[model samples]
Target: TTYKLILNLKQAKEEAIKELVDAGIAEKYIKLIANAKTVEGVWTLKDEILTFTVTE
Candidate 1:
């Protein structure tokens, strides 16, 4: 038998959003953009950051 540990960042983001709602924060002001990956053993996945943006 075997198992694995996972971070589940998507669920984390959802929890954060819920906290924002509980705190009366605007949905428009809440953003959880995630760079995520899954890995097993020495082999792993990495996310490449392209460009972060700021818009008017």
Candidate 2:
């Protein structure tokens, strides 16, 4: 397996959005992150977890 920050960020954002949905949060706000743009590079991918190494 390999690492890509853009994909990682997107994945994490999606998971968070899902959690929020299950928590009864408004879709409007969650949609904001879902529509965001993240770059690809320097990321961390673990068991059901994805995060950035350094975002700038």
Off by over 4 Å in 1: 1-5, 26-29, 33-56
Residue 20 alpha-carbon offset, candidate 1, angstroms: 0.1
Clashes of 1: 0
Q: Against the hidden reference, what TM-scores do the models get?
A: 0.37, 0.43
Taken over the whole model, the C-alpha lDDT of each candidate is: 0.34, 0.43
Give the alpha carbon lDDT tens digit for every residue of 1-56 in model 1.
35756546565445444444555444442343222233221112111111111122
lDDT of 2: 0.43
Largest lDDT belongs to which candidate?
2
lDDT of 2 by residue, 1-56 (tens): 55743255576556656644555445554554565453121121221122221233
Pick the TM-score winner.
2
**Model 1: how far residue 40 lies from native, Å:** 18
